[PDB]
């Protein structure tokens, strides 16, 4: 230092970068904190960063607001139990982890409404109800039989559910043997020339994919259950996954 | 302690080695077999560095430096005091980084996510390995790798560059620079865009990704979209490192003269080589 | 092989999206351009529409004149011969006035005047484009983060081309318009200032430039890794956290012991990037105005 301008500037920069990191870390604590013990009570050691002052997001289309930080709560039962007498070990599913939605089958209790676009219309629609939408490039999946990782057919593709504002494919709607349908995340299927293959699930697990309560829209809560369930099969359908 | 939403995801399984033997956390950190491997390699690494400090006669971290074996050693081993420590520390480094990548894979499996992170990370490891392993192997000596020291490695960068004139003239290096600057451009833009939608003018409602496409279309006539932009950032930054690896793997090996002179191939193409005027005639 | 979601498998198309209106003057938007199935494998297929008010027309025009002015000089350097123009393209240079002319505008066209003209046009192109980034945000009710972020890049450029030359007392300190010639300028700048590696601001700039690649690799990889739960729909994940946002936090928490939020990762992002050119521009500004030699300075200040 310090009767030199470059020295004053670099010293000042470090002070600023320390404040910036502090600010950035506290901004990143608007969700998930305070830290909890494994029983859900507040942990003793919160760290040296305090919770920031809340901010409020005004949500569009009369959906209200979100104020964070606020009271954290799962708003759903978690079918898991301890496997050790001390902290830091896994928690074993107490039933079927795919049905109970724990582990990599986990879902969050998002709003039970669909995501809306800029004009207040449902963001995701079956292509059949999406005026003017059509497949523009690539193999069209509609009509292909759907194969699970047990190398067995679980059903047939009956539509693509599309993101209207982003003009992209988000799910395949798949008809099962009983005539009902399910949604499969597009990120979890492989469209092949003569089939759609689903590595994550064996055929017998398709029935258990969480259903949507109205056939022409999907809610944020429903997306989370479907995507959770399908992801969970990488781990939990592993015994039925023939080598490939 | 756990995040408010964490418990449901801390289930058994996903490990690559050891079954349940290491399927546990220490505070926030997942361990696993590769957690134990990472600790072992890092720890042995840091202790060897600390010991190299002793042999150097300093404990200052702006001064501590571990140099590789001198070029006379070729690709054999060197005494600990004189390059040996560097060689074992490089093995520990490699073991730590790869162990860290594989631990990341175990974490992905437990969480049911894609493997894109450890895959991205593997480009950094490869860049490191180019400089300390592939390039030295291909040039015939460990002496060509960089020393491990905060400033001494910067000297290596400068001395290595000026060995080939102004290193700017490395064409793979120009591409790499371009991806780095473009990646930083995409990062500013992406952060600013999402925050501008999440944080609108005072009193107004959060904007929508439709607002994010509109902003960019109004502005430059194109929007890559929200899946697009994350694909882009991943491509830009991985491409930056790939070309970095490339620009060095070729320097000292296929090209070793002054980089400016490489551009003569274009200038001397026969259809214009002899046409007078210009800078080169 | 698991689908990795780097390229799309099926593209869908619908009616051209003409975008949100909010307060935007619609008279100034074009119609949509063509759709590119090629782009569509990676991002959106739709090209256009673009907004072109008077500030846009000014900025493009000015930007084109800047490109006209350098181009005319190049063609002249090439003796008007397209063979030579292509041959020597990277060697041509539009160079600023000599030291003798200081900060005056009195230099001949072939020897400074054209460089000033070009720099004039560029200055108008950039600043009005800056204003455009603010004004387009405003019309859609959005925050001004983009214009603030763009301002950090403008900073480094302003320092290199305008502020530092002015403080040094001559235009000859500014950067020439040329591919090779500007690389040479950069090298020479470091040599003559005692090696920029000893400039702490230059080091910081590198930390942020590398860190930007680190960060966007982390982030883009993370979002793609959780795209099977709708991860890229970040605004709604901000408004209503989903299992995408929770798995992404927890990947990082379990790996390195701390994590971000869906909004907050964008604050780390905007800052990591912007600090590239903030610190970078400080480093350059101080060079030759206050520190002639960074090695020397380094020996007396740490
Ligand atoms: C060498 C020494 C260097 C020292 C400092 C170097 C860098 C300084 C830059 C500071 C900028 C801070 C701006 C700000 O307040 O952001 C608002 C932001 C709120 O953002 P938001 O909630 O999304 O906005 C809501 C609305 O939409 C409202 O937002 P909006 O849409 O109207 O605008 C977005 C907002 C937020 O936008 C951003 O945060 C993006 C950041 C990009 C900013 C780049 C700055 C450009 C500078 C270019 C010129 C460089 C010259 C070099 C200097 O940006 C602004 O606040 C307006 C900035 C106006 C430009 C200022 C021109 C100055 C010349 O809160 C912060 O960013 C706080 C930053 C925390 C830094 C703390 C530093 C610690 C200080 C020391 C104490 C610690 C002791 C340790 C011991
Ligand atoms: C006088 C010097 C020469 C020159 C000589 C060289 C030389 C020599 C090299 C470069 C390299 C590069 N140069 Mg050059 N270069 C010059 C001018 C420039 C300019 C400029 C504006 O002028 C720029 C922007 C660049 C840009 C670059 C990049 C393209 C590339 C560096 C990134 C990289 O390799 O990442 C790759 C990333 C890594 C290697 C990081 C690896 C990280 C590992 C895996 C993780 C470590 C974990 C750590 C130990 C953990 C710590 C503990 C925790 C933090 C708790 N050069 C001048 C002309 N340049 C380098 C390159 O391409 O290398 C391959 C290189 O070797
Ligand atoms: C990539 C091309 C060249 C090179 C060229 C340059 C140039 C040029 C510069 C640096 C700079 C840095 N480099 Mg180097 N560097 C190289 C390879 C490496 C490797 C490696 C294991 O391969 C490491 C760990 C580093 C580490 C570093 C940091 C000391 C410093 C800031 C970087 C940064 O923020 O990056 C981005 C990463 C982050 C923001 C994440 C945090 C990373 C932290 C800071 C790493 C701490 C490293 C620690 C001190 C090393 C010891 C590990 C311990 C024993 C556990 N470099 C290769 C040889 N590097 C700058 C500097 O200021 O040097 C003095 C600088 O100007
Ligand atoms: C031999 C060369 C010297 C050296 C000399 C210099 C000089 C001189 C400078 C740098 C600077 C930088 N160097 Mg160095 N550098 C060296 C060695 C290195 C090494 C290395 C591995 O060895 C690395 C990684 C770097 C890296 C860096 C960067 C961190 C930094 C530039 C950031 C940036 O985004 O700029 C790019 C961003 C811009 C230039 C902003 C531009 C914004 C404007 C508004 C865009 C206008 C566009 C116009 C309209 C045309 C667009 C047309 C479109 C198609 C529409 N240097 C050696 C020591 N370096 C810069 C800096 O900040 O230093 C402190 C700088 O000035
Ligand atoms: C490929 C694109 C870019 C990228 C991506 C990237 N890096 C990553 C990842 C990804 C995707 C991770 O997932 C991983 C991570 O956890 O990040 C938080 C990581 C990572 N990138 C890191 C650093 C880093 N990345 C860099 C670069 C890049 N990373 C690219 C630009 C750089 C530089 C210099 O540019 C650095 C310094 C770490 C924060 C983290 C990896 C952490 C890790 O491997 O931990 C295990 C090892 C240890 C805890 C210590 C090892 C100790 C050694 C045995 C001794 C030290 C030897 C070393 C060679 C000495 C170096 C001295 C220096 C002065 C030269
Ligand atoms: C913060 C650090 C980084 C950063 C950030 C950043 N840059 C930015 C921004 C931000 C936040 C913007 O908002 C702004 C932007 O618009 O991005 C899309 C910008 C920008 N960064 C740019 C470039 C850029 N940034 C760089 C660097 C960086 N930018 C840093 C790494 C670099 C380098 C050198 O690394 C470059 C080259 C521009 C793309 C854009 C600013 C545009 C601008 O100022 O334009 C003025 C010039 C013109 C308008 C000329 C237009 C010429 C066209 C090609 C003509 C097209 C018309 C057609 C050919 C003819 C039609 C008529 C016919 C009859 C002739
Ligand atoms: C919320 O979400 C978001 C969106 O969605 C809603 C968005 O739309 C967007 C908006 C995004 C866009 C509109 C896309 C932006 C595009 C870019 C940032 C750049 C894309 C550019 C590339 C993919 C390529 C750039 C090219 C590079 C880096 C290479 C160039 C190389 C050189 C110049 C090399 C030098 C020359 C030579 C000759 C050397 C070699 C010679 C021989 C080998 C011979 C954002 C930000 C976003 O956040
Ligand atoms: C959208 O979603 C996303 C998130 O969340 C919602 C995220 O959080 C993140 C993550 C990003 C951030 C939190 C932003 C901040 C990060 C940076 C600026 C990048 C650089 C990071 C660092 C420099 C920190 C590095 C720390 C490391 C590598 C850990 C150090 C580790 C230890 C000291 C413990 C070692 C653990 C071991 C050895 C394993 C076994 C342990 C034993 C005890 C045995 C991203 C990308 C994201 O996209
Ligand atoms: C970031 C800026 C980069 C440099 C700045 C310039 C970038 C934009 C360049 C602008 C070029 C536009 C060309 C002229 C515009 C034009 O006339 O388009 C016409 C046509 C037809 O419509 P009309 O003429 O019929 O509309 C007339 C109005 N009405 C119908 C109301 C009467 O419309 C179009 O084709 C618009 C399509 C423009 C697409 C532009 Br060129 C996109 Br593809 C450029 C993409 C470049 C990406 C930007 C680089 C950004 C880099 C960092 C991250 C962004
Ligand atoms: C580039 C440097 C980034 C390092 C940021 C350091 C943040 C450490 C955060 C630790 C806090 C974790 N905790 C206890 C709040 O959960
Ligand atoms: C691949 C990177 C380093 C490989 C090093 C190969 C040689 C082993 C180092 C041991 C040197 C010490 N000693 C006494 C055994 O020679």
PDB file of N, CA and C in Angstrom, chain A residues 159-223:
ATOM      1  N   UNK A 159     -49.822 -39.134 -28.461  1.00  0.00           N
ATOM      2  CA  UNK A 159     -49.672 -37.717 -28.740  1.00  0.00           C
ATOM      3  C   UNK A 159     -48.366 -37.263 -28.166  1.00  0.00           C
ATOM      4  N   UNK A 160     -48.001 -36.056 -28.549  1.00  0.00           N
ATOM      5  CA  UNK A 160     -46.884 -35.357 -27.969  1.00  0.00           C
ATOM      6  C   UNK A 160     -47.540 -34.223 -27.215  1.00  0.00           C
ATOM      7  N   UNK A 161     -47.098 -33.969 -25.996  1.00  0.00           N
ATOM      8  CA  UNK A 161     -47.534 -32.794 -25.267  1.00  0.00           C
ATOM      9  C   UNK A 161     -46.470 -31.759 -25.500  1.00  0.00           C
ATOM     10  N   UNK A 162     -46.885 -30.591 -25.987  1.00  0.00           N
ATOM     11  CA  UNK A 162     -45.949 -29.577 -26.437  1.00  0.00           C
ATOM     12  C   UNK A 162     -45.980 -28.345 -25.577  1.00  0.00           C
ATOM     13  N   UNK A 163     -44.838 -27.678 -25.495  1.00  0.00           N
ATOM     14  CA  UNK A 163     -44.722 -26.381 -24.860  1.00  0.00           C
ATOM     15  C   UNK A 163     -45.038 -25.365 -25.942  1.00  0.00           C
ATOM     16  N   UNK A 164     -46.181 -24.700 -25.886  1.00  0.00           N
ATOM     17  CA  UNK A 164     -46.581 -23.757 -26.959  1.00  0.00           C
ATOM     18  C   UNK A 164     -45.589 -22.598 -27.092  1.00  0.00           C
ATOM     19  N   UNK A 165     -45.395 -21.820 -26.016  1.00  0.00           N
ATOM     20  CA  UNK A 165     -44.479 -20.649 -26.166  1.00  0.00           C
ATOM     21  C   UNK A 165     -43.021 -20.964 -26.546  1.00  0.00           C
ATOM     22  N   UNK A 166     -42.538 -22.142 -26.181  1.00  0.00           N
ATOM     23  CA  UNK A 166     -41.179 -22.502 -26.567  1.00  0.00           C
ATOM     24  C   UNK A 166     -41.120 -23.526 -27.710  1.00  0.00           C
ATOM     25  N   UNK A 167     -42.278 -23.859 -28.294  1.00  0.00           N
ATOM     26  CA  UNK A 167     -42.340 -24.739 -29.450  1.00  0.00           C
ATOM     27  C   UNK A 167     -41.381 -25.901 -29.298  1.00  0.00           C
ATOM     28  N   UNK A 168     -41.637 -26.702 -28.274  1.00  0.00           N
ATOM     29  CA  UNK A 168     -40.812 -27.831 -27.974  1.00  0.00           C
ATOM     30  C   UNK A 168     -41.655 -28.978 -27.427  1.00  0.00           C
ATOM     31  N   UNK A 169     -41.193 -30.207 -27.629  1.00  0.00           N
ATOM     32  CA  UNK A 169     -41.877 -31.410 -27.139  1.00  0.00           C
ATOM     33  C   UNK A 169     -41.491 -31.673 -25.679  1.00  0.00           C
ATOM     34  N   UNK A 170     -42.478 -31.843 -24.810  1.00  0.00           N
ATOM     35  CA  UNK A 170     -42.219 -32.075 -23.390  1.00  0.00           C
ATOM     36  C   UNK A 170     -42.559 -33.445 -22.849  1.00  0.00           C
ATOM     37  N   UNK A 171     -43.636 -34.048 -23.332  1.00  0.00           N
ATOM     38  CA  UNK A 171     -43.943 -35.407 -22.948  1.00  0.00           C
ATOM     39  C   UNK A 171     -44.483 -36.140 -24.137  1.00  0.00           C
ATOM     40  N   UNK A 172     -44.462 -37.465 -24.028  1.00  0.00           N
ATOM     41  CA  UNK A 172     -45.208 -38.344 -24.881  1.00  0.00           C
ATOM     42  C   UNK A 172     -46.386 -38.906 -24.066  1.00  0.00           C
ATOM     43  N   UNK A 173     -47.589 -38.912 -24.660  1.00  0.00           N
ATOM     44  CA  UNK A 173     -48.708 -39.490 -23.977  1.00  0.00           C
ATOM     45  C   UNK A 173     -48.847 -40.894 -24.478  1.00  0.00           C
ATOM     46  N   UNK A 174     -48.869 -41.831 -23.542  1.00  0.00           N
ATOM     47  CA  UNK A 174     -48.737 -43.249 -23.861  1.00  0.00           C
ATOM     48  C   UNK A 174     -49.926 -44.034 -23.392  1.00  0.00           C
ATOM     49  N   UNK A 175     -50.586 -44.730 -24.305  1.00  0.00           N
ATOM     50  CA  UNK A 175     -51.754 -45.511 -23.983  1.00  0.00           C
ATOM     51  C   UNK A 175     -51.355 -46.908 -23.514  1.00  0.00           C
ATOM     52  N   UNK A 176     -51.898 -47.294 -22.366  1.00  0.00           N
ATOM     53  CA  UNK A 176     -51.633 -48.591 -21.775  1.00  0.00           C
ATOM     54  C   UNK A 176     -52.663 -49.594 -22.231  1.00  0.00           C
ATOM     55  N   UNK A 177     -52.432 -50.840 -21.837  1.00  0.00           N
ATOM     56  CA  UNK A 177     -53.239 -51.994 -22.255  1.00  0.00           C
ATOM     57  C   UNK A 177     -54.719 -51.838 -21.919  1.00  0.00           C
ATOM     58  N   UNK A 178     -55.028 -51.164 -20.809  1.00  0.00           N
ATOM     59  CA  UNK A 178     -56.417 -50.900 -20.362  1.00  0.00           C
ATOM     60  C   UNK A 178     -57.059 -49.669 -20.992  1.00  0.00           C
ATOM     61  N   UNK A 179     -56.375 -48.982 -21.900  1.00  0.00           N
ATOM     62  CA  UNK A 179     -56.967 -47.824 -22.594  1.00  0.00           C
ATOM     63  C   UNK A 179     -56.745 -46.464 -21.942  1.00  0.00           C
ATOM     64  N   UNK A 180     -56.285 -46.436 -20.711  1.00  0.00           N
ATOM     65  CA  UNK A 180     -55.915 -45.157 -20.097  1.00  0.00           C
ATOM     66  C   UNK A 180     -54.532 -44.757 -20.611  1.00  0.00           C
ATOM     67  N   UNK A 181     -54.133 -43.509 -20.330  1.00  0.00           N
ATOM     68  CA  UNK A 181     -52.866 -43.005 -20.812  1.00  0.00           C
ATOM     69  C   UNK A 181     -51.976 -42.478 -19.673  1.00  0.00           C
ATOM     70  N   UNK A 182     -50.671 -42.340 -19.933  1.00  0.00           N
ATOM     71  CA  UNK A 182     -49.745 -41.687 -19.006  1.00  0.00           C
ATOM     72  C   UNK A 182     -48.815 -40.782 -19.804  1.00  0.00           C
ATOM     73  N   UNK A 183     -48.190 -39.867 -19.097  1.00  0.00           N
ATOM     74  CA  UNK A 183     -47.198 -39.031 -19.681  1.00  0.00           C
ATOM     75  C   UNK A 183     -45.808 -39.546 -19.289  1.00  0.00           C
ATOM     76  N   UNK A 184     -44.917 -39.555 -20.267  1.00  0.00           N
ATOM     77  CA  UNK A 184     -43.520 -39.856 -20.125  1.00  0.00           C
ATOM     78  C   UNK A 184     -42.778 -38.591 -20.510  1.00  0.00           C
ATOM     79  N   UNK A 185     -41.861 -38.125 -19.654  1.00  0.00           N
ATOM     80  CA  UNK A 185     -40.939 -37.044 -19.978  1.00  0.00           C
ATOM     81  C   UNK A 185     -40.136 -37.336 -21.263  1.00  0.00           C
ATOM     82  N   UNK A 186     -39.982 -36.323 -22.088  1.00  0.00           N
ATOM     83  CA  UNK A 186     -39.382 -36.505 -23.436  1.00  0.00           C
ATOM     84  C   UNK A 186     -37.881 -36.713 -23.213  1.00  0.00           C
ATOM     85  N   UNK A 187     -37.383 -36.101 -22.144  1.00  0.00           N
ATOM     86  CA  UNK A 187     -35.999 -36.271 -21.757  1.00  0.00           C
ATOM     87  C   UNK A 187     -35.714 -37.701 -21.293  1.00  0.00           C
ATOM     88  N   UNK A 188     -36.725 -38.549 -21.138  1.00  0.00           N
ATOM     89  CA  UNK A 188     -36.457 -39.917 -20.650  1.00  0.00           C
ATOM     90  C   UNK A 188     -36.856 -40.999 -21.632  1.00  0.00           C
ATOM     91  N   UNK A 189     -36.976 -40.637 -22.910  1.00  0.00           N
ATOM     92  CA  UNK A 189     -37.305 -41.609 -23.909  1.00  0.00           C
ATOM     93  C   UNK A 189     -36.317 -41.451 -25.024  1.00  0.00           C
ATOM     94  N   UNK A 190     -36.165 -42.531 -25.767  1.00  0.00           N
ATOM     95  CA  UNK A 190     -35.335 -42.597 -26.922  1.00  0.00           C
ATOM     96  C   UNK A 190     -36.278 -42.958 -28.070  1.00  0.00           C
ATOM     97  N   UNK A 191     -36.473 -41.999 -28.980  1.00  0.00           N
ATOM     98  CA  UNK A 191     -37.323 -42.237 -30.135  1.00  0.00           C
ATOM     99  C   UNK A 191     -36.435 -42.936 -31.128  1.00  0.00           C
ATOM    100  N   UNK A 192     -36.821 -44.145 -31.481  1.00  0.00           N
ATOM    101  CA  UNK A 192     -36.145 -44.956 -32.464  1.00  0.00           C
ATOM    102  C   UNK A 192     -37.078 -45.159 -33.685  1.00  0.00           C
ATOM    103  N   UNK A 193     -36.490 -45.630 -34.775  1.00  0.00           N
ATOM    104  CA  UNK A 193     -37.237 -45.736 -36.016  1.00  0.00           C
ATOM    105  C   UNK A 193     -38.480 -46.611 -35.918  1.00  0.00           C
ATOM    106  N   UNK A 194     -38.502 -47.572 -34.995  1.00  0.00           N
ATOM    107  CA  UNK A 194     -39.617 -48.542 -34.899  1.00  0.00           C
ATOM    108  C   UNK A 194     -40.195 -48.661 -33.513  1.00  0.00           C
ATOM    109  N   UNK A 195     -39.759 -47.816 -32.609  1.00  0.00           N
ATOM    110  CA  UNK A 195     -40.248 -47.868 -31.254  1.00  0.00           C
ATOM    111  C   UNK A 195     -39.776 -46.617 -30.530  1.00  0.00           C
ATOM    112  N   UNK A 196     -40.336 -46.427 -29.344  1.00  0.00           N
ATOM    113  CA  UNK A 196     -39.788 -45.547 -28.358  1.00  0.00           C
ATOM    114  C   UNK A 196     -39.359 -46.479 -27.216  1.00  0.00           C
ATOM    115  N   UNK A 197     -38.095 -46.390 -26.828  1.00  0.00           N
ATOM    116  CA  UNK A 197     -37.542 -47.131 -25.710  1.00  0.00           C
ATOM    117  C   UNK A 197     -37.414 -46.300 -24.462  1.00  0.00           C
ATOM    118  N   UNK A 198     -37.905 -46.884 -23.366  1.00  0.00           N
ATOM    119  CA  UNK A 198     -37.807 -46.289 -22.043  1.00  0.00           C
ATOM    120  C   UNK A 198     -36.949 -47.156 -21.084  1.00  0.00           C
ATOM    121  N   UNK A 199     -35.682 -46.785 -20.984  1.00  0.00           N
ATOM    122  CA  UNK A 199     -34.740 -47.468 -20.094  1.00  0.00           C
ATOM    123  C   UNK A 199     -35.098 -47.442 -18.594  1.00  0.00           C
ATOM    124  N   UNK A 200     -35.656 -46.337 -18.138  1.00  0.00           N
ATOM    125  CA  UNK A 200     -35.906 -46.096 -16.730  1.00  0.00           C
ATOM    126  C   UNK A 200     -36.967 -47.054 -16.130  1.00  0.00           C
ATOM    127  N   UNK A 201     -37.957 -47.483 -16.919  1.00  0.00           N
ATOM    128  CA  UNK A 201     -39.064 -48.297 -16.406  1.00  0.00           C
ATOM    129  C   UNK A 201     -39.218 -49.612 -17.186  1.00  0.00           C
ATOM    130  N   UNK A 202     -39.464 -50.695 -16.451  1.00  0.00           N
ATOM    131  CA  UNK A 202     -39.920 -51.947 -17.057  1.00  0.00           C
ATOM    132  C   UNK A 202     -41.417 -51.863 -17.292  1.00  0.00           C
ATOM    133  N   UNK A 203     -41.904 -52.714 -18.159  1.00  0.00           N
ATOM    134  CA  UNK A 203     -43.279 -52.578 -18.663  1.00  0.00           C
ATOM    135  C   UNK A 203     -44.303 -52.580 -17.568  1.00  0.00           C
ATOM    136  N   UNK A 204     -44.162 -53.494 -16.616  1.00  0.00           N
ATOM    137  CA  UNK A 204     -45.048 -53.611 -15.437  1.00  0.00           C
ATOM    138  C   UNK A 204     -45.117 -52.349 -14.563  1.00  0.00           C
ATOM    139  N   UNK A 205     -44.170 -51.436 -14.692  1.00  0.00           N
ATOM    140  CA  UNK A 205     -44.200 -50.258 -13.866  1.00  0.00           C
ATOM    141  C   UNK A 205     -44.965 -49.083 -14.481  1.00  0.00           C
ATOM    142  N   UNK A 206     -45.438 -49.248 -15.730  1.00  0.00           N
ATOM    143  CA  UNK A 206     -46.089 -48.137 -16.426  1.00  0.00           C
ATOM    144  C   UNK A 206     -47.447 -47.777 -15.789  1.00  0.00           C
ATOM    145  N   UNK A 207     -48.148 -48.771 -15.285  1.00  0.00           N
ATOM    146  CA  UNK A 207     -49.487 -48.577 -14.693  1.00  0.00           C
ATOM    147  C   UNK A 207     -49.409 -47.595 -13.524  1.00  0.00           C
ATOM    148  N   UNK A 208     -48.296 -47.648 -12.786  1.00  0.00           N
ATOM    149  CA  UNK A 208     -48.093 -46.891 -11.569  1.00  0.00           C
ATOM    150  C   UNK A 208     -47.620 -45.463 -11.763  1.00  0.00           C
ATOM    151  N   UNK A 209     -47.215 -45.085 -12.980  1.00  0.00           N
ATOM    152  CA  UNK A 209     -46.984 -43.673 -13.288  1.00  0.00           C
ATOM    153  C   UNK A 209     -48.222 -42.864 -12.821  1.00  0.00           C
ATOM    154  N   UNK A 210     -48.032 -41.858 -11.971  1.00  0.00           N
ATOM    155  CA  UNK A 210     -49.072 -40.939 -11.535  1.00  0.00           C
ATOM    156  C   UNK A 210     -49.896 -40.345 -12.678  1.00  0.00           C
ATOM    157  N   UNK A 211     -51.203 -40.419 -12.559  1.00  0.00           N
ATOM    158  CA  UNK A 211     -52.135 -39.974 -13.600  1.00  0.00           C
ATOM    159  C   UNK A 211     -52.491 -38.500 -13.459  1.00  0.00           C
ATOM    160  N   UNK A 212     -52.995 -37.913 -14.522  1.00  0.00           N
ATOM    161  CA  UNK A 212     -53.352 -36.485 -14.480  1.00  0.00           C
ATOM    162  C   UNK A 212     -54.859 -36.480 -14.348  1.00  0.00           C
ATOM    163  N   UNK A 213     -55.413 -35.540 -13.593  1.00  0.00           N
ATOM    164  CA  UNK A 213     -56.831 -35.609 -13.286  1.00  0.00           C
ATOM    165  C   UNK A 213     -57.699 -35.066 -14.408  1.00  0.00           C
ATOM    166  N   UNK A 214     -57.142 -34.240 -15.283  1.00  0.00           N
ATOM    167  CA  UNK A 214     -57.872 -33.756 -16.465  1.00  0.00           C
ATOM    168  C   UNK A 214     -56.998 -34.108 -17.676  1.00  0.00           C
ATOM    169  N   UNK A 215     -57.594 -34.677 -18.719  1.00  0.00           N
ATOM    170  CA  UNK A 215     -56.808 -35.181 -19.851  1.00  0.00           C
ATOM    171  C   UNK A 215     -56.182 -34.133 -20.781  1.00  0.00           C
ATOM    172  N   UNK A 216     -56.563 -32.853 -20.694  1.00  0.00           N
ATOM    173  CA  UNK A 216     -56.002 -31.839 -21.620  1.00  0.00           C
ATOM    174  C   UNK A 216     -55.091 -30.830 -20.955  1.00  0.00           C
ATOM    175  N   UNK A 217     -54.655 -31.100 -19.722  1.00  0.00           N
ATOM    176  CA  UNK A 217     -53.694 -30.244 -19.067  1.00  0.00           C
ATOM    177  C   UNK A 217     -52.998 -31.059 -17.998  1.00  0.00           C
ATOM    178  N   UNK A 218     -51.816 -30.585 -17.620  1.00  0.00           N
ATOM    179  CA  UNK A 218     -51.047 -31.185 -16.546  1.00  0.00           C
ATOM    180  C   UNK A 218     -50.639 -30.106 -15.548  1.00  0.00           C
ATOM    181  N   UNK A 219     -50.744 -30.410 -14.256  1.00  0.00           N
ATOM    182  CA  UNK A 219     -50.436 -29.398 -13.227  1.00  0.00           C
ATOM    183  C   UNK A 219     -49.003 -29.500 -12.814  1.00  0.00           C
ATOM    184  N   UNK A 220     -48.483 -28.438 -12.221  1.00  0.00           N
ATOM    185  CA  UNK A 220     -47.091 -28.472 -11.751  1.00  0.00           C
ATOM    186  C   UNK A 220     -46.896 -29.647 -10.794  1.00  0.00           C
ATOM    187  N   UNK A 221     -47.882 -29.921  -9.950  1.00  0.00           N
ATOM    188  CA  UNK A 221     -47.771 -31.017  -9.004  1.00  0.00           C
ATOM    189  C   UNK A 221     -47.666 -32.377  -9.701  1.00  0.00           C
ATOM    190  N   UNK A 222     -48.504 -32.544 -10.712  1.00  0.00           N
ATOM    191  CA  UNK A 222     -48.556 -33.758 -11.544  1.00  0.00           C
ATOM    192  C   UNK A 222     -47.277 -33.966 -12.328  1.00  0.00           C
ATOM    193  N   UNK A 223     -46.717 -32.893 -12.883  1.00  0.00           N
ATOM    194  CA  UNK A 223     -45.408 -33.044 -13.603  1.00  0.00           C
ATOM    195  C   UNK A 223     -44.352 -33.609 -12.667  1.00  0.00           C
TER     196      UNK A 223
END
